[PDB]
Design a protein around this ligand. Structure first.
Ligand SMILES: NC(=O)c1ccc[n+]([C@@H]2O[C@H](COP(=O)([O-])OP(=O)(O)OC[C@H]3O[C@@H](n4cnc5c(N)ncnc54)[C@H](O)[C@@H]3O)[C@@H](O)[C@H]2O)c1
Ligand SMILES: NC(=O)c1ccc[n+]([C@@H]2O[C@H](COP(=O)([O-])OP(=O)(O)OC[C@H]3O[C@@H](n4cnc5c(N)ncnc54)[C@H](O)[C@@H]3O)[C@@H](O)[C@H]2O)c1
Ligand SMILES: [Cl-]
Ligand SMILES: [Cl-]
Lengths: 328, 321
């Protein structure tokens, strides 16, 4: 046996590789960057046929987590090249090599979660993406479904929750959680995205010291979304790899309940000591519940990392960081 | 200015001809010249430069250009032309302020060759089983993304298999030759590398040229829609012009499929050739596709019955002979 994990230098991919190696399993990574773990890995691109053939040699299962995201139109061609064409060729190569199971990392942006037709969002919700990234994942799902119906290779489609390492949650410098929960990092993120109207609104709400942000929509409805610990995503991915009943399946993978920002921000602020600034953003905002009932019932998935557990760990990490910075 | 991609192909050249006869302003776009001398870009959907030149000053796009191949060596190109080319053309059209974009899709998106229910309606699941069918499904999703997101109107037309009337009784035509004549079908299957099917067909040869009546392994005659190019052109004009086509998805083709057990004797009555009946391994082809939506929404009326098509095909055959 040999398991190929693409995107093995990324958040989830590295954790999946690590888990498999603690099991003593033979794993090969495949990522544009080295992982820095010094494990067996191809350092190369999903765009390159040579890298694909090298990566697939002798492989019995593929966990396809490698993908590219960008908001810049300059990068859109690359996003389709990596996410659509790369997935297409990797699927064909895996099938030709007699791979037994191919697990595809999809996203709730295929629905999209940011514009649900009903709640909770189940796997049979329409697939009507409104972002180019969501569109690439939908096209990827269709490539996977084509193989599911036509070859001996088993497939699993997993629609990922937004995923964080617990320690990222209370780190101003984290890529997602910094702007998600801290006002000044969000000002900076929005400026760098070039969203001037939002950036200026955020700056206008600054209270003269660092603060948390509690994001709500134009009607003052607090944001709500699934934030899932990397460790639970890993557990579900391992189930997708090994469980008999995963074959041919499509599953939302994420924690049971969304974080309600109205409840969550006070809990966060109780841990950091920072004041909270509430901002009403234009539009519907982010407000979704995504059902993980199918994966719970079909594969026996159970998430263990509740937001309360994640926050406790995030806080410990933050305090260690601040102790070091302040020489305490 | 109407841009028609695939303008040197079967349906595209006819659409361009129809629009030009009406006195409309049309620009072609195809890998090949049309041979008509009309305004056209000779170039590729894979070429960003060619896309830029083709889209300039354009107000509507009829996107009929695409590549089909059964060979694995050709699969990368099929995806590059049908998926990536469509993606970039859509983006170019949208940015240029194109008012309506009509996309030529296929019954292969369903697929018609393995229906879940009959007749096949637009809400039939989309589960293609050929790489070509897959490229058209992905193209449809690209169009749907634009339909939902931009001001550019879209129309998706799922095409019936389409023939010029004259092709039907021509042994040398690409589709109808093998479809209805035994020896051309042997040659086709040989050139595809389907050596064992070619051998079955060869074993049925009666020592002179013959028609083939294709059935499945249980002797169920094949049944499929074969629509005249002229009816497809009529439907495409409606997709271009009709206010109610906007945001629509329509099966485009004639009302009824041809059942080959009925069709082949009609064909043989016109050519004089004997008929050889072949029972192919597997489920064969058997489908009815509903055009009710386009009939009732756009006022589409198919006019070229198979009998009319065959009369024209026979006349053309007789002139050739
Ligand atoms: N983390 C999330 O919140 C989240 C949510 C929904 C979906 N997803 C999807 O789940 C998967 C993994 O999530 P993640 O957080 O670990 O993503 P990540 O961005 O942290 O990791 C992605 C990895 O893919 C690699 N990659 C990019 N282009 C490549 C190429 N051409 N060839 C080889 N590798 C390439 C990157 O180098 C990167 O290491 C991705 O497909 C992602 O799109 C993630
Ligand atoms: N004829 C049918 O039975 C049928 C059935 C279902 C769907 N379709 C689809 O309807 C459309 C019209 O079909 P047709 O019968 O006219 O086919 P066709 O093969 O006669 O015409 C296709 C044209 O597309 C052009 N083309 C190919 N690659 C190109 C590229 N990279 N750039 C620019 N042009 C390119 C070709 O040169 C050709 O002229 C096609 O999209 C086809 O896939 C046709
Ligand atoms: Cl947010
Ligand atoms: Cl046939």
């Amino acid at each position: 046996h040999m398991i190929l994990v693409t995107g093995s230098a990324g958040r989830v991919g590295r954790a999946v590789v690590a888990a498999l190696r603690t099991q003593g399993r033979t794993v090969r990574g495949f990522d544009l960057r080295p992982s820095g773990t010094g494990g067996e890995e191809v350092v190369g691109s999903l765009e390159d046929g040579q890298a694909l053939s090298d990566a697939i040699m002798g492989v019995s299962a593929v966990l396809h987590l490698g993908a590219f995201m960008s908001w810049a139109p300059a990068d859109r061609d690359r996003m389709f090249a990596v996410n659509v064409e790369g997935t297409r060729r990797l699927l064909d190569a895996a099938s030709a090599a007699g791979v037994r199971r191919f697990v595809f990392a999809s996203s709730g942006e295929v629905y999209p979660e940011n514009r649900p037709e009903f709640l909770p969002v189940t796997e049979d919700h329409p697939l009507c993406p409104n972002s180019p990234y969501g569109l690439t994942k939908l096209l990827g799902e269709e490539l996977v479904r084509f193989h599911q119906r036509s070859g001996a290779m088993e497939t699993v489609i997993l629609r990922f929750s937004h995923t964080q390492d617990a320690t990222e949650l209370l780190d101003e410098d984290s890529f997602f959680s910094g702007p998600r929960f801290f006002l000044r990092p969000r000002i900076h993120q929005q400026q760098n995205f070039g969203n001037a109207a939002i950036a200026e609104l955020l700056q206008s709400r600054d209270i003269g010291e660092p603060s948390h942000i509690l994001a709500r929509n134009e009607n003052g409805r607090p944001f709500r979304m699934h934030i899932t610990d990397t460790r639970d995503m890993v557990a579900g991915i391992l189930l997708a790899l090994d469980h008999p009943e995963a074959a041919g399946g499509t599953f939302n993978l994420g924690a049971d309940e969304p974080a309600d920002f109205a409840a969550l921000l006070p809990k966060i602020a109780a841990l950091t000591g920072l004041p909270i600034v509430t901002v009403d953003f234009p539009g519907d905002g982010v407000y979704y519940h995504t059902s993980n009932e199918r994966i719970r019932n079909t594969l026996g998935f159970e998430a263990e990392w509740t937001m309360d557990r994640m926050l406790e760990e995030a806080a410990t990490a933050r305090r260690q960081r601040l102790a070091k910075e302040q020489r305490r």
